Every structure is written in structure tokens, then in C-alpha cells.
Design a binder for this molecule. Structure first.
Ligand SMILES: [Ca+2]
Ligand SMILES: [Ca+2]
Ligand SMILES: [Ca+2]
Ligand code: NA
Length: 182
């Protein structure tokens, strides 16, 4: 029950994502089995991550990701938001995944990623989870800004972030997967 989307909603979500109608319905079944209410909350989102990272404290990073999934900022991830975020992150083009990643790093949505916003995310990633030159979130952030901040003003515009990411082979590789594979 409800474990079926209305016809118009299947048509709409299939047209807004890289999934087939059958895939959208399969994801809804899984979403509903795990979230009876159809509303994934911050705490429920925290568990999906705690699963994959029993060793670290994924609370801060899971919260950062939750906020990007929560396109309506109502504090709950509804299926439409869930499937569209899974679509871009798992199957989007490189340019699409970069725009999503920018949204993740630009904490206050002002169009620039400041050094401190990036540090917050990277520190969260380290807390969630090395060679000396990358053993602290501050060193990782300094290298990223050395490589991407072209006008050297301490902030990355979407253009600096996209170009800077495309210049780095490891970043290009990480954002070029489709269902986890090249
Ligand atoms: Ca929401
Ligand atoms: Ca910002
Ligand atoms: Ca800049
Ligand atoms: Na390159």
C-alpha cells in the first residue's frame, strides 16, 4: 500500500531522472520499506551513513548531504527529492555531478565556496572516515585552493570549481561514474 506511485508521478519522476519507469518503482518500494512514513528525516538519514562508516562519526557529513537532498528544506527527504538526488549523484554527467558537488560545498548558497565552508565539509569527511602531505583537513583544503582559486581571493566561484575539478585527474575520475563504474 502506497508502495505504488500514482501514474502521473511515475511519468514525471521517470522524465526528471536517468532511471526507467521500472527502476523508479523499484526505488520507491525500497524507499517505502525502509521509510514507512515516506518522509526520510535527518535521524533516519544519519543511519544510512552510520551503516557504511561504523568506524567514524558520520554525523556532520551525513547532515551536510542531507541538506542538499532536502531541496525544499522542510527537514524531511520525500521520494521525489530522494530519487532526483540519487539520479544526479549516481548517473549524472560530469558537469551535472559538479553542479551538485558545488551545492554541497556552498553551505550558505551564495554562489561561492569559501575556504571555511570547504574546511567544514572536508573536516566532516575526515571525521567520517594518510600520507603526511594530506593528513589534515587544512592541508587538503590548502591544496584545493592552491589549484582552483585563480584570482586568489579565498573563494571559489562555480566556474573556478568546475575548471579546477576538470584539471585534476582524480576528481574527474571520481565524478565520472555511472552506477559506480566508469
Ligand atoms: Ca524535503
Ligand atoms: Ca558560500
Ligand atoms: Ca576565487
Ligand atoms: Na588534467
Amino acid at each position: 500500500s502506497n508502495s505504488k506511485l500514482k501514474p502521473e508521478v511515475v511519468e514525471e519522476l521517470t522524465r526528471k531522472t536517468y532511471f526507467t519507469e521500472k527502476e523508479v518503482q523499484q526505488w520507491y518500494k525500497g524507499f517505502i520499506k525502509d521509510c514507512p512514513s515516506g518522509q526520510l528525516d535527518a535521524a533516519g538519514f544519519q543511519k544510512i551513513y552510520k551503516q557504511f562508516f561504523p568506524f567514524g562519526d558520520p554525523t556532520k557529513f551525513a547532515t551536510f548531504v542531507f541538506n542538499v537532498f532536502d531541496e525544499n528544506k522542510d527537514g524531511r527527504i520525500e521520494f521525489s527529492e530522494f530519487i532526483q538526488a540519487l539520479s544526479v549523484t549516481s548517473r549524472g554527467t560530469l558537469d551535472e555531478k559538479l553542479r551538485w558537488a558545488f551545492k554541497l560545498y556552498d553551505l550558505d548558497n551564495d554562489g561561492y565556496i569559501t575556504r571555511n565552508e570547504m574546511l567544514d565539509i572536508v573536516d566532516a569527511i575526515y571525521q567520517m572516515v594518510l600520507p603526511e602531505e594530506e593528513n589534515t583537513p587544512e592541508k587538503r583544503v590548502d591544496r584545493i585552493f592552491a589549484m582552483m582559486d585563480k584570482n586568489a581571493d579565498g573563494k571559489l566561484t562555480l566556474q573556478e570549481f568546475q575548471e579546477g575539478s576538470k584539471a585534476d585527474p582524480s576528481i574527474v575520475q571520481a565524478l565520472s561514474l555511472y552506477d559506480g563504474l566508469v
